[PDB]
C-alpha cells in the first residue's frame, strides 16, 4: 500500500487535537495528509488552525483530487466542509464524527437545532461516510446533557471535547479495520439545512418559558451572533422554576425579566457592552 495512511480533513480543535494525537501515537508526518476547510486562514483564532498545525509539523496539504487514488487510505472528516462522493475514492475507509446524537439532527447548525427543538441531551456520533448527509452507519456514540442554561456556544465546546474523546476511543479499531457498525433507523431521523435556520432569530413570545428560553440560548454564540431583544444583545438566559405570572415582559438596564404562557421566570442578561 501507499506511504500515505491517513487524511485528516476539517477544522477546529477537534481536527487539530486529533491530528496531534495521530502524530504522537500512530503515524509519522510523511504518512499523513491534511485537507483544511476552505475558510482556514492559517492562523489560530478562537480555535486552532488545522492548516497551521499541518504546516508547522511538515504534513502535506492536499486536495480531495490528490487522495482519491490512494489505495487503502483512511479518510477522516472532523468538521470537514465538503460533501464527498464515495465512488470518487479507491478506498472505502471513509469516516466522520457528527455533532449530534444520530439519527437526530443530521445536517448543519447542530449547536442550534437541538436546543431550538427542546432537547435535554445531545451527542457525538462516529459513523461511516456514505453519499448522504450524516446518513452512514453508526460505529460509536456518546450522548451527554444539554444543561438547562447552556447556550449554543456551550454545546459546541462540548461537541469539541466529546468528539475529540470519541476519536481517541475508536481510532485504533478504525486503523485496524476491526470496528463494528449498525445502519441508522428511519424513525427519529431529522435534518436541518442552512435555509431552515434564520440566524437573526425573532423570538415568539407566545410560547412556554422553556420555549422562549430555548429560543434565546440556541442563538447565543457570540463569535457569530447574539439574539437581540429591543435592540440589546443577550449574552445569557437563565430559566427558573419560580412562577411569576403568565406572559411577563419587563426591561431593566442590565436584563429582561420574561415569562411565557406557563409563567416561569426567565432572566435574559444583556451583553455588558
Amino acid at each position: 500500500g501507499h506511504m500515505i495512511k491517513i487524511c485528516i480533513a476539517g477544522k477546529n480543535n477537534i481536527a487539530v487535537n486529533s491530528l496531534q494525537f495521530i502524530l504522537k501515537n500512530y503515524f509519522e508526518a510523511d504518512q499523513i495528509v491534511v485537507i483544511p476547510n476552505k475558510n482556514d486562514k492559517g492562523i489560530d483564532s478562537w480555535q486552532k488552525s488545522l492548516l497551521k498545525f499541518a504546516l508547522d509539523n511538515n504534513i502535506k496539504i492536499v486536495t480531495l483530487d490528490e487522495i482519491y487514488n490512494i489505495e487503502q487510505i483512511i479518510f477522516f472528516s472532523l468538521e470537514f466542509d465538503q460533501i464527498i462522493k464515495i465512488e470518487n475514492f479507491k478506498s472505502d475507509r471513509l469516516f466522520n464524527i457528527h455533532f449530534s446524537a444520530l439519527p437526530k439532527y443530521k445536517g448543519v447548525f447542530t449547536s442550534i437545532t437541538p436546543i431550538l427543538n427542546n432537547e435535554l441531551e445531545s451527542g457525538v456520533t462516529l459513523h461511516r461516510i456514505d453519499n448522504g448527509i450524516d446518513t452512514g452507519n453508526i460505529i460509536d456514540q456518546h450522548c451527554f446533557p444539554i444543561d438547562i442554561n447552556d447556550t449554543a456556544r456551550d454545546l459546541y465546546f462540548n461537541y469539541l471535547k466529546y468528539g475529540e474523546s470519541i476519536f481517541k476511543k475508536n481510532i485504533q479499531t478504525i486503523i485496524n479495520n476491526s470496528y463494528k457498525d449498525l445502519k441508522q433507523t428511519n424513525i427519529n431521523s431529522s435534518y436541518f439545512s442552512r435555509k431552515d435556520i434564520n440566524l437573526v432569530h425573532k423570538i415568539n413570545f407566545k410560547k412556554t418559558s422553556f420555549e422562549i428560553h430555548n429560543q434565546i440560548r440556541a442563538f447565543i454564540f457570540q463569535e457569530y451572533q447574539l439574539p437581540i431583544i429591543n435592540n440589546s444583545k443577550i449574552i445569557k438566559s437563565i430559566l427558573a422554576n419560580e412562577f411569576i405570572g403568565y406572559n411577563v415582559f419587563e426591561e431593566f438596564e442590565n436584563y429582561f425579566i420574561i415569562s411565557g404562557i406557563d409563567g416561569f421566570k426567565i432572566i435574559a442578561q444583556k451583553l455588558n457592552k
Copy 2:
C-alpha cells in the same frame, strides 16, 4: 347545596359519552347542566353532538355566567372552547382533560403538533384548570403510541378513546374530592397557538423521509383538510424501512413515491385512488 351538581362543557364523543356515563352512574338529569361549544348545531355527524344529547335527555343548556355563582359545582371541560377565569367561579372544582402528554403540547391542534414535531407517543392528561392554558396541576395521565402511519385524524380518535377512559377511571375521586395532583414542570413544557400552524401545509422536501412523512400525515384529517402534493389531495402516507435512493420524487396516477435526504421509501396515496 344547589340543584345543579355538575356541568359538562365542551363537545364531541368524549363530552357525550362522559355525560352518558355520569347519567348512568352518578347524577340525574335535573342535577346536570351543559355548555355546548359555540359551533354545536345539535346534529350528530362524524362526532356526536352534546347539544343534541342534552336536549334528548332533558338536561338544561346554560351559559358560563349562569353557573359562576353556583356553590360546589363540578365543572368539567371536555374539549370546551372557552378560556375560563377561575376567580369568576365560587367553586374550585374545575377540571379538564387535555389531549396531549403534558407538559408537552399545550395549546391547540394537538392531533397535528406532536406528529409534526416527530413524536412517537402522545397521551391524554386530566388536570385542574388554572388561569393558564393547559397549565394546571396534573391528576392523571395515560400515554399511548402514535403508530408510524397514523394520521392526525387517527390520533384524534385515540384522544377521544383514551380521554373517555381516563374520565371514567378518575371521576369517582373527583366526585369524592379525594384525588391527588402534582404541579407541572417548567422543563419539556411546550405550546402551540392557532397562529403557529398553517393549515395549508407546504411540505419541505429537504428533510428526512420520517420528517416528510410526518409533514404529510400531521395534516390528514379529511373533515377539515388534506395536504396537497402536485395539485393532488393526499389521504394516507406509508413510511417503510426500505432504502430507495436519496431525494426520490415521482408522481403516479394513484400515489407518489418519495424519499428524503436519508432515502427511505414513502408512499403518499392520492384521495382519487378507488
